[PDB]
């Protein structure tokens, strides 16, 4: 019957690894590098687009940075379509929580939910896992500014600074070198862009190959504001930090 | 017994020159017993305002439901929902409970951000849209409001003239209804400013 | 090499099971032809009764789907009858739901969409048949629409299907290159049937008796098949000029 | 290769090898036949006597569907019973809705579509029987034969099983020598002969003859088994022709 | 409603009035209550208009699909499909249907299906609210093997009386003739049938 | 070989290997005999023990007052099929006030076994059954194979070394069929028949299992000292 | 009939490749060339009507399909797969949008819905990916004119101009030289016809080319989607 | 059940709930505690249909305790009240609705404020300085309307509560067998054992 | 409500009043009751309004999808069937009462659809609370094969009868003329009543209303 054709996506190897999770991680290693850096007064999300062309409409384009609600955003590394399935599920969970408790969802509770969905695809159902790794940048009134990552296994961890996608080994060393705990957002913006500029497989880092975002508690009247940077604004910050 | 008159209360909305107004009383009761004088019946999702009269649990539930839906709308559409679009969403959402409906009287008010056109609308409990340019009324003193609005209203009123018209329409209607009153709020809505005024009225 | 057993992509972007279903199409070794008149649509098909023990009246690959729609099948009879029963069901459901007779091209599209599903879903195999639907549509007039195991379909001025389809196709192409019109300019269906048989004779290089052919005719408000004697009358007229 | 391991897989030829393998199980079975006569049909089958311990006339092979249709098959006997059970359900639902007993061509397609369905998926095995069936309806007598692929046609005479070639040759003679037709009583006699002649392919073990018939004049268009004197008369006629 | 079907020498004729009422208001005075389920199998409808229309459409579908597979259905087969629907859904239906049809083998046949969903094969049948007033008349005046003209007169006179006495019946008398020759529609206006 | 992985696959010669392997489980099972006259029907079964401390596995199961069987092969499959027969016998009695005909019982068992040979995921039954009964047409003996093939016989045997008992019955056919109105002599013939399948071991008091049904005899099983009379 | 294919038929290989998606993209590569160009006051989409036989009436086969009054779609790859996507896209535009909001979806969201359907055929049990790449052109009030590509994986990207299928690599180079941000719709149609001529072997006329635009409203409001006639194409081939 | 009162003062919320349980003819108990601790700083009193009241209260308790363990965090009174309202609002269109009315008295440790929520069986939520369910408000609200101040001490709140209970004991036909009184503040929940 | 339709020589003429009520109160004096089904087919609605509005919208949407697939204009019988079968399924619980009129490839057709799922095919029909007043005008003056302006006037005269004599009907008169060559949507076709004139201005002067507190938030 049908058994003949079944790849068995939810089995252990003899070494106790999940084949499909490992191979999905291999896929993610070829995706454009995404970086998240947490500062005392905000969070930076920077990400590099892949295989850009001149004829791509950049100002209406979104492949890396997505809004989950007004307080939480994500940077994507992997299959964009797979990411959008999960993103829409996360957006719903946040609104379910808001409806139930009349409070914005704490960052970790959303992260755990998405990570649990990813976990399920590795333990049951016989389906391939989601080929996506997320960096979650968010704020709530319990833990303040938070960075998390999740990968196809459904494991998640918290970070002060982190990278996903291509050249994470190199990227993480550079972040580990220059990151300090008392760092501010404007400094973190510079660190993120400098790290991408050195780890990129492209010849030079330009505005058309980047997506950029900041979550700053600072706002007039102390409200958290998410800023997805426009193409011209990325171009300005590249000049300001002295990369172009 | 009648779910639409257990808790009581009213909403009225009006159009003016480059503006709209929406207003409501503040009463919540259990039939004869007054329970709350701070039960606001007007909510907003971006620049679109929604008033809801009727059974108070459904008022609250529908507010929570439309906040949910307009939040997801905004995330997907990358823009705030417009009054015309929202009106259709309310109608759809009410009619999907055709045979177990929410006992409510919604009223939409807002200005279309692109055309600048003032917009107001109303619905029956199962979603039929009352789409009228002059005024929309709802609640346990809807008859009283129809009477006040029909005689006080005239077209193209300036924001502060319109404030006086809608306020007097609300106040005097509420005072002829046992189940309405206990305070009142009036929103004056222009293309990029909204003024919210609480009115002084009799507390019986 | 399990990409050849089920309907998933090979490294070349091909579906081998679909391709092999096309080959099953010719297993009967029968050729069919369809042409359009002014007021009619004619379909002819070879009839071969190799066994003397068979009841020749029950050996048929032409199906009366609805009153207006006829369907000839090129392929094995089990899959032909599978497709025939489904098309009949679909045509009846359509008339009930939408209050008018299912058009030929709308049925064709529906059956093509079903066939597409078998090329995408693994548990279902393709049917090893090519379906040629014929009618005189009330809006489009004389109509020929053909469906295959890939889920492809298109309308035709005329068409041919089977092992020797190319010979028939080129013969028809050459005629329509002369006349410069999309149909057989003839009043009576009897003469359009005569044209269809004559041009099959020319293309295949074989003579036919009354029992070697099978004919279906679509007119306004009915599709019908011809008896052996109705075909004989047709063959007599061909021989007499 | 591997195209023959799974049902519903097309080989590069455009063939379903699992259906062709089902045919081998049919070819391995005992000889069964069908003869269409003037106002009806006759069915006959070879029943191999494996042992003296088999109770004579008890292991009945031919099966009735509704009251007017006879079914006989060669190959895997259980698969045939399963098909007849379905046939009986199809005939019952037809009569429930439409009142009239199922016409034979209608009934043929019901079996046909069901057998064909078992060639569409790898989760089922094709039927390991060829089924000869028919009877009398409002339009007269009809004889059918249905193969593991779902293929069926109407027949003047039909034969399947190990002795089918022998049987087919005998049936072809009858068709040629009787263009005007064969009577029901003649067809019973001829059916006996043909099974006896076809028994040369299974000559090791002796056998038991079983015959049934539906005829408008002889059985009122109902399916009945040939029993007693009429059966013995057909056996005697058959035994005389082999000697 | 006043409806009837009558077998005669050459086949069968169906007859009906054209009045449809909502209480005392005549919502349609020119209603067609003789409905076609197959070429030469028609029915007369009484009861809920929604129900009998729904049923008749389902039957037409069943017989169309029957025809595609098995050829022309018998009138008995048509009646059986009507019965099946009426009997199995008796709790949710108000439908009194007369089924009439012409075969060449069987000739003219009439089947009546009253409220319960029972079937009764009859030489002729009457139904609808107005039928009560013509049981006496129809029983006294019906003969078997009447001519076409005699049967038209019998139906015309019968429904004339049913219309005269039943307020729920009225308007034109429609008829449908079913013979080997084909299908003929007839209509008779008030000024004709009232003076009978 | 390549065609024995599941029951849904024919071999190139039209064989079903999973069914044939299920048939093999019966051959490994202990011998049991069935035989009948015109008045009575008898089952005899050689029960098998695990060792000298263990009990002897029961071989005969009662299905109704007028019907029961003996098993050879997978005993849990016999439990499933005998439970199904109990239910079908019971349904016939409750709904129709009718004792289930032995021939119809055979037909039901055939069809139940067949479904497991044509569908993916399942497996064939791994047991053979000898069904005896007395119904409105007298005494009956059936042989069930998990292929689905059910056969009505005067006598038979299944299990290991069953060919010896089967040959004996084939010789004795004319004698034992005539043993009418004498239950003890019919059982004697069954005990003598099963003895032709023994090697090394002989019939002891806790080894032998006998059952009988007849004209004025409900289906009753004899074990222990009740069968010492026949040793 | 138990659909036992409850498991994924597209899985990750050791290198991190999703084989079936790659192979689907190969099927798209073999497909006939189609392109899209965005102007300031419109969008144009175009493709070749590769007729399988001259006896076939290629007008009855529509490669360019209206999805909503203001959105159109063209493809490269497997035609039958495209047809069912168009049917689902038309339907989803009503069920998940128009019946809720009383208006047609904006281009980007309808693209998102099609993309979702394609992604699911890449992960769900017992199915292969769709063997097509779509080019979806459209207009809506708040986003203006837009052009999107959708691939077998479910990934989608917005374009100023692009091409897919047979001669896409050459065609994309041709478009890079000609495209600017000041093109009028007629200029974009002209460039579309020039680009498409390079990848067409045989006859090049209004009967062998299928071309549609998203532009001004054609008189609630008029539809912006308009399929150009055979004659309208031939008129612009004289000024070529 | 019968009388449940609530009053929010400066720095605490006080809930007073009757002790009687009557099954038709007889008073079966005179010491019944019509309350559940949902979390360390959140108390819910309840009254309505027999069985449904305790079943509902314990179900809510279980869910809040589950939340507390999962997140290692105490939900705000507002969050708990919204959760409770949703469960009641869900209930009202069910096959068999929970006929239960509640008061939720909580101390918000983040805002350092006491909060009182009144929710009826329909899911009608209101935040109030003082509240009641059934007929209890009819007798007591005129006294609370007169005397209540937002800056009252806990002791002044208990005295105003005594006056409310005295009025109830005078004019109500039913003997509700006095009230158990509980105070919710920054330090948690405690019972006043002499009232 | 008074809604009506007739079949004339070249097509269909539909008519409707504009009063929408809540109890005995008029909520909207200019409500559009003629609805689009497809480009060649329109619906007049009476009965429960939400039901009429939703049922017409749903069938219109499904017809649109049908028409995209087939590539031809939809027919009135298919609109009739889809409405009829849905209404029948809901057993009168969807209180949609419609006048459906359009022009096909097979010509002009007019139906009345009832909540329980019965339909009548007629040359002229009326529905709503004003049906009798409207029908009296039709019985008085209808003839088959009228010219366009004659038919227009008859429908308008029929709706007027309902407006004046039925308390449940009022306001303006709306028409929809459908033929092969055109679709004319006339809103309003006639205004038979002037809005009442008010003799005084009762609008208050600024500062008359007593305000507790105010807040201004910009956008
Ligand atoms: Cl379809
Ligand atoms: Mg008041
Ligand atoms: Mg008062
Ligand atoms: Mg497949
Ligand atoms: Mg009368």
Curated annotation (Swiss-Prot), chain A:
Pfam families: Proteasome (PF00227), Proteasome_A_N (PF10584). It is found in: Cytoplasm; Nucleus. GO terms for biological process: proteasomal ubiquitin-independent protein catabolic process; proteasome core complex assembly; proteasome-mediated ubiquitin-dependent protein catabolic process. Its main location: cytoplasm. CDD domains: proteasome_alpha_type_4. InterPro entries: Ntn_hydrolases_N, Proteasome_alpha, Proteasome_alpha-type, Proteasome_asu_N, Proteasome_bsu_CS, Proteasome_sua/b. PROSITE patterns: PROTEASOME_ALPHA_1, PROTEASOME_ALPHA_2. Disulfide bonds: none annotated. There is a cross-link at residues 99, 198, 230 (Glycyl lysine isopeptide (Lys-Gly) (interchain with G-Cter in ubiquitin)). SMART domains: Proteasome_A_N. Transmembrane segments: none annotated. Keywords: Cytoplasm, Isopeptide bond, Nucleus, Proteasome, Ubl conjugation. GO terms for cellular component: cytosol; nucleus; proteasome complex; proteasome core complex, alpha-subunit complex; proteasome storage granule. Belongs to the peptidase T1A family. The proteasome degrades poly-ubiquitinated proteins in the cytoplasm and in the nucleus. It is essential for the regulated turnover of proteins and for the removal of misfolded proteins. The proteasome is a multicatalytic proteinase complex that is characterized by its ability to cleave peptides with Arg, Phe, Tyr, Leu, and Glu adjacent to the leaving group at neutral or slightly basic pH. It has an ATP-dependent proteolytic activity. Present with 17100 molecules/cell in log phase SD medium. This is Proteasome subunit alpha type-3. It comes from Saccharomyces cerevisiae (strain ATCC 204508 / S288c) (Baker's yeast).
From Swiss-Prot, chain C:
It is found in: Cytoplasm; Nucleus. Its main location: cytoplasm. The modification Phosphoserine is found at residue 227. InterPro entries: Ntn_hydrolases_N, Proteasome_alpha, Proteasome_alpha-type, Proteasome_asu_N, Proteasome_sua/b, Proteasome_subunit_alpha6. The keyword Magnesium does not apply. The keyword Ubl conjugation applies. Belongs to the peptidase T1A family. This is Proteasome subunit alpha type-1. It comes from Saccharomyces cerevisiae (strain ATCC 204508 / S288c). The lineage of its organism: Eukaryota, Fungi, Dikarya, Ascomycota, Saccharomycotina.
Curated annotation (Swiss-Prot), chain D:
Its main location: cytoplasm. It is found in: Cytoplasm; Nucleus. The keyword RNA-binding does not apply. Keywords: Acetylation, Cytoplasm, Nucleus, Proteasome. The keyword Cytoplasm applies. One of its GO terms (cellular component) is proteasome complex. One of its GO terms (molecular function) is mRNA binding. The alpha and beta forms are probably products of the same gene with different post-translational modifications. One of its GO terms (biological process) is proteasome-mediated ubiquitin-dependent protein catabolic process. The 26S proteasome consists of a 20S proteasome core and two 19S regulatory subunits. The 20S proteasome core is composed of 28 subunits that are arranged in four stacked rings, resulting in a barrel-shaped structure. The two end rings are each formed by seven alpha subunits, and the two central rings are each formed by seven beta subunits. The catalytic chamber with the active sites is on the inside of the barrel. The proteasome degrades poly-ubiquitinated proteins in the cytoplasm and in the nucleus. It is essential for the regulated turnover of proteins and for the removal of misfolded proteins. The proteasome is a multicatalytic proteinase complex that is characterized by its ability to cleave peptides with Arg, Phe, Tyr, Leu, and Glu adjacent to the leaving group at neutral or slightly basic pH. It has an ATP-dependent proteolytic activity. Present with 12000 molecules/cell in log phase SD medium. Belongs to the peptidase T1A family. The gene is PRE10.
UniProtKB/Swiss-Prot annotation, chain E:
The keyword Ribosomal protein does not apply. Keywords: Acetylation, Cytoplasm, Hydrolase, Nucleus, Protease, Proteasome, Threonine protease, Zymogen. The active site is at residue 1. It is an enzyme of class 3 (hydrolase). CDD domains: proteasome_beta_type_6. It comes from the Eukaryota. It catalyses: Cleavage of peptide bonds with very broad specificity. Its EC number is 3.4.25.1. GO terms for biological process: proteasomal ubiquitin-independent protein catabolic process; proteasome-mediated ubiquitin-dependent protein catabolic process. The proteasome degrades poly-ubiquitinated proteins in the cytoplasm and in the nucleus. It is essential for the regulated turnover of proteins and for the removal of misfolded proteins. The proteasome is a multicatalytic proteinase complex that is characterized by its ability to cleave peptides with Arg, Phe, Tyr, Leu, and Glu adjacent to the leaving group at neutral or slightly basic pH. It has an ATP-dependent proteolytic activity. PRE3 and PRE4 are necessary for the peptidyl-glutamyl-peptide-hydrolyzing activity. This subunit is necessary for the peptidylglutamyl-peptide hydrolyzing activity. The side chain of Thr-1 acts as a nucleophile, and the N-terminal amino group acts as a proton acceptor. Present with 7250 molecules/cell in log phase SD medium. Belongs to the peptidase T1B family. This is Proteasome subunit beta type-1.
């Amino acid at each position: 019957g049908s058994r003949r054709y079944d790849s068995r996506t939810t089995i252990f190897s003899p070494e106790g690894r999940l084949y499909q999770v490992e191979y999905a991680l291999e896929s993610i290693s070829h995706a454009g590098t995404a970086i998240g850096i947490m500062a005392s007064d905000g969070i930076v999300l920077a990400a590099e687009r892949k295989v850009t062309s001149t004829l791509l409409e950049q100002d209406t384009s979104t492949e890396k940075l997505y809004k989950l609600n007004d307080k939480i955003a994500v940077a994507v590394a992997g299959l964009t379509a797979d990411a959008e399935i999960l993103i829409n599920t996360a957006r719903i969970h946040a609104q379910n929580y808001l409806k139930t408790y009349n409070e914005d969802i704490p960052v970790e509770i959303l992260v755990r939910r998405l990570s649990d969905i990813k976990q399920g695809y590795t333990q049951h159902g016989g389906l391939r896992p989601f080929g996506v790794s997320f960096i979650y940048a968010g704020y709530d009134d319990r833990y303040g500014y938070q960075l998390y990552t999740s990968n196809p296994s459904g494991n998640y961890t918290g970070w002060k600074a982190i990278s996903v996608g291509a050249n994470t080994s190199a990227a993480q060393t550079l972040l580990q070198m220059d990151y300090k705990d008392d760092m501010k957002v404007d400094d973190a913006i510079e660190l993120a862009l400098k790290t991408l500029s050195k780890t990129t497989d492209s010849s030079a880092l330009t505005y058309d190959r980047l997506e950029f975002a900041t979550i700053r508690k600072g706002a007039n009247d102390g409200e958290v504001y998410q800023k997805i940077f426009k193409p011209q604004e990325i171009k300005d910050i590249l000049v300001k930090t002295g990369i172009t | 017994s009648d779910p639409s008159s257990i808790n009581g209360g009213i909403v009225v909305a009006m159009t003016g020159k480059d503006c709209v107004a929406i207003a409501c009383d503040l009463r919540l009761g259990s039939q004869s017993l007054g329970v709350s004088n701070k039960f606001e019946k007007i909510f907003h999702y971006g620049h679109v305002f929604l008033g809801i009269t009727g059974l108070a649990t459904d008022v609250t539930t529908l507010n929570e439901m439309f906040r949910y839906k307009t939040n997801l709308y905004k995330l997907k559409e990358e823009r705030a929902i417009e009054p015309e679009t929202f009106t259709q969403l309310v109608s759809s959402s009410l009619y999907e409970r055709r045979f177990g409906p929410y006992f409510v009287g919604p009223v939409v008010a807002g200005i279309n951000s692109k055309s600048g056109k003032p917009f107001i609308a109303g619905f029956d409990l199962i979603g039929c849209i009352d789409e009228a340019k002059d005024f929309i009324v709802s609640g346990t003193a809807s008859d009283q409001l129809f009477g006040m609005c029909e005689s006080l209203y005239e077209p193209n009123l300036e924001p502060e003239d319109l404030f006086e018209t809608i306020s007097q329409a609300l106040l005097n209607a509420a005072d002829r209804d046992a189940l309405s009153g206990w305070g009142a709020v009036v929103y004056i809505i222009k293309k990029d400013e909204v003024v919210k005024r609480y009115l002084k009225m009799r507390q019986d | 090499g399990y990409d050849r057993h089920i309907t998933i992509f090979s490294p070349e972007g091909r579906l081998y099971q679909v391709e092999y279903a096309f080959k099953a199409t010719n297993q009967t070794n029968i050729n069919s032809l369809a042409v359009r008149g002014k007021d009619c649509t004619v379909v002819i098909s070879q009839k071969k009764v190799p066994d003397k023990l068979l009841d020749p009246t029950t050996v048929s690959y032409i199906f009366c789907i609805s009153r207006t729609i006829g369907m000839v099948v090129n392929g094995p009879i089990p899959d032909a009858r599978n497709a025939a029963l489904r098309a009949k069901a679909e045509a009846a459901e359509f008339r009930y739901k939408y209050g008018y007779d299912m058009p030929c091209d709308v049925l064709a599209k529906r059956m093509a969409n079903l066939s597409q599903i078998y090329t995408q879903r693994a548990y279902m195999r393709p049917l090893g048949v090519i379906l040629t639907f014929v009618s005189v549509d009330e809006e489009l007039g004389p109509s020929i629409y053909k469906t295959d195991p890939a889920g492809y379909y298109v309308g035709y001025k005329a068409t041919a299907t089977g092992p020797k389809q190319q010979e028939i196709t080129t013969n028809l192409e050459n005629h329509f290159k002369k006349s410069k019109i999309d149909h057989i300019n003839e009043e009576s269906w009897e003469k359009v049937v005569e044209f269809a048989i004559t041009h099959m004779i020319d293309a295949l290089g074989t003579e036919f008796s009354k029992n070697d052919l099978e004919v279906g005719v679509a007119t306004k408000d009915k599709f019908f098949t011809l008896s052996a004697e109705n075909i004989e009358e047709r063959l007599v007229a061909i021989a007499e000029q | 290769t591997g195209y023959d391991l799974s049902n519903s897989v097309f080989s590069p030829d455009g063939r379903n090898f699992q259906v062709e393998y089902a045919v081998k199980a049919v070819e391995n079975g005992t000889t069964s036949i069908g003869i269409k006569c003037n106002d009806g049909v006759v069915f006959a089958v070879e029943k191999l006597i494996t042992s003296k311990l088999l109770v004579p006339q008890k292991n009945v092979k031919i099966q009735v569907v509704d009251r007017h249709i006879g079914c006989v098959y060669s190959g895997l006997i259980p698969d045939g019973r399963h098909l007849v059970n379905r046939g009986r359900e199809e005939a019952a639902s037809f009569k429930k809705l439409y009142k009239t007993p199922i016409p034979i061509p209608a009934f043929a397609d019901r079996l046909g579509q069901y057998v064909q369905a078992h060639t569409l998926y790898n989760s089922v095995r094709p039927f390991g029987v060829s089924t000869i069936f028919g009877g009398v309806d409002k339009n007269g007598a009809h004889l059918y034969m249905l193969e593991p692929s779902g293929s069926y046609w109407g027949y003047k005479g039909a034969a399947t099983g190990k002795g089918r070639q022998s049987a087919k040759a005998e049936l072809e003679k009858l068709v040629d020598h009787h263009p005007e037709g064969l009577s029901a009583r003649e067809a019973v006699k001829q059916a006996a002969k043909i099974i006896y002649l076809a028994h040369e392919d299974n000559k090791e073990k002796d056998f038991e003859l079983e015959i049934s018939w539906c005829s408008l004049s002889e059985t009122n268009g109902l399916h009945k088994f040939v029993k007693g004197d009429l059966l013995q008369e057909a056996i005697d006629f058959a035994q005389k022709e082999i000697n | 409603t006043s409806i009837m079907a009558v077998t005669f020498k050459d086949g069968v004729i169906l007859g009906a009035d054209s009045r449809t009422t909502t209480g005392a208001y005549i919502a349609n005075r020119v209603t067609d209550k003789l409905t076609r389920v197959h070429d030469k199998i028609w029915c007369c409808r009484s009861g809920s208009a929604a129900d009998t229309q729904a049923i008749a459409d389902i039957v037409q579908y069943h017989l169309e699909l029957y025809t595609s597979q098995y050829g022309t259905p018998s009138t008995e087969t048509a009646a059986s499909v009507f019965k099946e629907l009426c009997y199995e859904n008796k709790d949710n239906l108000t439908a009194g249907i007369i089924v009439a049809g012409y075969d060449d083998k069987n000739k003219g046949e009439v089947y009546t299906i009253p409220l319960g969903g029972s079937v009764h094969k009859l030489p002729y049948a009457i139904a609808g609210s107005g039928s009560t007033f013509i049981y006496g008349y129809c029983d006294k005046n019906f003969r078997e093997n009447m001519s076409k003209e005699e049967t038209v007169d019998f139906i015309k006179h019968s429904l004339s009386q049913a219309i005269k006495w039943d307020g729920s019946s009225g308007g034109v008398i429609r008829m449908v003739v079913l013979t080997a020759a084909g299908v003929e529609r007839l209509i008779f206006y008030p000024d004709e049938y009232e003076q009978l | 070989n390549n065609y024995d992985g599941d029951t849904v696959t024919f071999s190139p010669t039209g064989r079903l290997f999973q069914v044939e392997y299920a048939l093999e489980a019966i051959k490994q099972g202990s011998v049991t005999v069935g035989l009948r006259s015109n008045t009575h029907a008898v089952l005899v079964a050689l029960k098998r023990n695990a060792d000298e401390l263990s009990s002897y596995q029961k071989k005969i199961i009662k299905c109704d007052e007028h019907m029961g069987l003996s098993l050879a092969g997978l005993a849990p499959d016999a439990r499933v099929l005998s439970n199904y027969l109990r239910q079908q016998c019971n349904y016939s009695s409750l709904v129709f006030n009718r004792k289930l005909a032995v021939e119809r019982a055979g037909h039901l068992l055939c069809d139940k076994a067949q479904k497991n040979t044509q569908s993916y995921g399942g497996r064939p039954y791994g047991v053979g059954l000898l069904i005896i009964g007395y119904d409105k047409s007298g005494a009956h003996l059936l042989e069930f194979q998990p292929s689905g093939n059910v056969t009505e016989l005067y006598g038979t045997a299944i299990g290991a070394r069953s060919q010896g008992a089967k040959t004996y019955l084939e010789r004795t056919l004319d004698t034992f069929i005539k043993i009418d109105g004498n239950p003890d002599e019919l059982i004697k013939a069954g005990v003598e028949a099963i003895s032709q399948s023994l090697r090394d071991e002989s019939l002891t008091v806790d080894n032998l299992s006998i059952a009988i049904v007849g004209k004025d005899t409900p289906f009753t099983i004899y074990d222990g000292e009740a069968v010492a009379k026949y040793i | 009939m138990t659909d036992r294919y409850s498991f994924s038929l597209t899985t990750f290989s050791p290198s991190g490749k999703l084989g079936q998606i790659d192979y689907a993209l190969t099927a798209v590569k073999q497909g006939v060339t189609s392109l899209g160009i965005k102007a300031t006051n419109g969008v144009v989409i175009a493709t070749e009507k590769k007729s399988s036989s001259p006896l076939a009436m290629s007008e009855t086969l529509s490669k360019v399909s209206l999805l909503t009054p203001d959105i159109g779609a063209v493809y490269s790859g497997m035609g039958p797969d495209y047809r069912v996507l168009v049917d689902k896209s038309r339907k989803v535009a009503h069920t998940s949008y128009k019946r809720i909001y009383g208006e047609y979806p904006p281009t980007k969201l309808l693209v998102s819905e099609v993309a979702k359907i394609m992604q699911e055929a890449t992960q769900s049990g017992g199915v292969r990916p769709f063997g097509v790449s779509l080019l979806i052109a459209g207009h809506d009030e708040f986003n203006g004119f837009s052009l999107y590509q959708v691939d077998p994986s479910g990934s989608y990207f917005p374009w100023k101009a692009t091409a897919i299928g047979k001669g896409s690599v050459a065609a994309k180079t041709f478009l890079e030289k000609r495209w600017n941000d000041e093109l009028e719709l007629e200029d974009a149609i002209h460039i579309a016809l020039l680009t498409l001529k390079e990848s067409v072997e045989g006859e090049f006329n209004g009967d062998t080319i299928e071309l549609a635009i998203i532009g001004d409203e054609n008189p609630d409001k008029g539809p912006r989607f308009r399929k150009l006639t055979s004659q309208e194409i031939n008129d612009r081939l004289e000024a070529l | 059940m019968d009388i449940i009162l609530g009053i929010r003062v400066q720095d605490s919320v006080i809930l007073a709930s009757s002790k009687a349980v009557t099954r038709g003819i007889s008073v079966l108990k005179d010491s019944d505690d019509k309350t559940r601790q949902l979390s360390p700083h959140t108390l819910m009193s309840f009254a309505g249909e027999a069985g449904d009241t305790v079943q509902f209260a314990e179900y809510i308790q279980a869910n809040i305790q589950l939340y507390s363990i999962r997140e290692d965090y105490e939900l705000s009174p507002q969050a708990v009240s919204s959760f409770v309202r949703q469960e009641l609002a869900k209930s009202i269109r069910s096959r068999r609705p929970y006929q239960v009315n509640v008061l939720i008295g909580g101390y918000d440790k983040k805002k350092n404020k006491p909060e009182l929520y009144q929710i009826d069986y329909l899911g009608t939520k209101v935040e109030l300085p003082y509240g009641a369910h059934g007929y209890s408000g009819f007798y007591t609200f005129s006294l609370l309307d007169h005397h209540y101040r937002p800056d009252m001490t806990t002791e002044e709140g208990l005295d105003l509560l005594k006056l409310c209970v005295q009025e109830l004991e005078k004019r109500m036909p039913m003997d509700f067998k006095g009230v158990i009184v509980k105070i919710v503040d920054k330090d948690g929940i405690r019972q006043v054992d002499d009232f | 409500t008074t809604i009506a339709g007739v079949v004339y020589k070249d097509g269909i003429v539909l008519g409707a009043d504009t009063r929408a009520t809540e109890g005995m109160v008029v909520a909207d004096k200019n409500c559009s009751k003629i609805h689009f089904i497809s480009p060649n087919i329109y619906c007049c609605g009476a009965g429960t309004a939400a039901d009429t509005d939703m049922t017409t919208q749903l069938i219109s949407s499904n017809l649109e999808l049908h028409s995209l697939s087939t590539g031809r204009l939809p027919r009135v019988v298919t609109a009739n069937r889809m409405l009829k079968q849905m209404l029948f399924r809901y057993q009168g619980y969807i209180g949609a009462a419609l006048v459906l009129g359009g022009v096909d490839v097979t010509g002009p057709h007019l139906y009345s659809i009832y909540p329980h799922g019965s339909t009548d095919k007629l040359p002229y029909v009326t529905m709503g609370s004003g049906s009798l007043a409207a029908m009296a005008v039709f019985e008085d003056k209808f003839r088959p094969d009228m010219e366009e302006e004659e038919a227009k006037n008859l429908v308008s005269e029929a709706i007027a009868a309902g407006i004046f004599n039925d308390l449940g009907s009022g306001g303006n008169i709306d028409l929809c003329v459908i033929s092969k060559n055109k679709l004319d949507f006339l809103r309003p076709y006639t205004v038979p009543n002037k809005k009442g004139t008010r003799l005084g201005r009762y609008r208050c002067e600024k500062g008359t209303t007593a305000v507790l507190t105010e807040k201004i938030t910009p956008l």
